């Protein structure tokens, strides 16, 4: 049930890991920088996400986060259906890859306004979510969920 | 009023919990930091503003209002930085009752979590999903969508 579906995505820059959750129907994202991608870091990220938006299903980014009993524990706690991220629609690989390339492009455009990577990544989240492609992803996600609530 | 948020800083376990409240819905975001600094408050506002359409923030005290780092983030993210004077004295009470509720919830989960930051995020989840009716998470999406339309 597609207002509530999100996809995890993990990409790397500067020897660090940027973990992203994408709301599939709108392309809105949340992201954070962590030193490496562990079940504990992924579980905490998902607890954060589910306290902020009505997360029904998460498609995990890889088999290690799908297997992780810590990740399964957070998804139980927060009431999320934990699913695999197999691109049964091959259009998903491309969408995620193009998203990672866009975010890295934005990060480079700001990277020198920020001493730390985490600031640049949050600046890139802001720019991505506010960009009008015309509605922005931040407007699409609120419209979609409000439509569902009503 | 869809874009109005209030900062609030409360303390537990020798640590600081920074909260932003969306005033019209009561929805909240929060984090644990070792102490309140302008840099920490500035980063939290940058995070908030990338996730919701933050027009105005009422700062939680005069040090965050003065901090040029906080002003720099509010410039970056397009937020009007305002004071947090409770011209409506009901604001004082609402924030204090909120902090007491969050600490209650934190105590109710605290033993499912090794670290305070997990407990605080469990409490954010319970607060935003609580039906008071509609929940604060429903109210904030309702209000912003209504404004967009």
């Amino acid at each position: 049930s597609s207002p509530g579906i999100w996809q995890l995505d993990c990409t790397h820059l500067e020897g660090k890991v940027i973990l992203v959750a994408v709301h599939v129907a709108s392309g809105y994202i949340e992201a954070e920088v962590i030193p490496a991608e562990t079940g504990q870091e992924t579980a905490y990220f998902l607890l954060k996400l589910a306290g902020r938006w009505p997360v029904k299903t998460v498609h995990t980014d890889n088999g290690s986060n799908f297997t992780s009993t810590t990740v399964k524990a957070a998804c139980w706690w927060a009431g999320i259906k934990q699913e695999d991220g197999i691109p049964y629609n091959p259009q998903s690989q491309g969408v995620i890859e193009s998203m990672n390339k866009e975010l890295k492009k934005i990060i480079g455009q700001v990277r020198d306004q920020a001493e730390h990577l985490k600031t640049a990544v949050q600046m890139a989240v802001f720019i991505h979510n506010h960009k009008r492609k015309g509605y922005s992803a931040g407007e699409r996600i609120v419209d979609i969920i409000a439509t569902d609530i009503q | 009023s869809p874009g109005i948020w209030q900062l609030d800083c409360t303390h537990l376990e020798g640590k600081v919990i920074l909260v932003a409240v969306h005033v019209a819905s009561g929805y909240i975001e929060a984090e644990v930091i070792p102490a309140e600094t302008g840099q920490e408050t500035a980063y939290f506002l940058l995070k908030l503003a990338g996730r919701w359409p933050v027009k105005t923030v009422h700062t939680d005290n005069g040090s965050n209002f003065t901090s040029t780092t906080v002003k720099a983030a509010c410039w970056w993210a397009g937020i009007k930085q305002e004071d947090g004077i409770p011209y409506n004295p009901q604001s004082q009470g609402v924030i204090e009752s909120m902090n007491k509720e969050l600490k209650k919830i934190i105590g109710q989960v605290r033993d499912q979590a090794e670290h305070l930051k997990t407990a605080v995020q469990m409490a954010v989840f319970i607060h935003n999903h609580k039906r008071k009716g509609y929940s604060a998470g429903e109210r904030i999406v309702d209000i912003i969508a209504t404004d967009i339309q």
């Binding site: 920020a114 | 780092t69 720099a72």
Partner: peptide, 8 residues
């Protein structure tokens, strides 16, 4: 440092 996150 002339950075948004480190104005020094």
């Amino acid at each position: 440092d002339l950075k948004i996150d480190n104005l020094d």
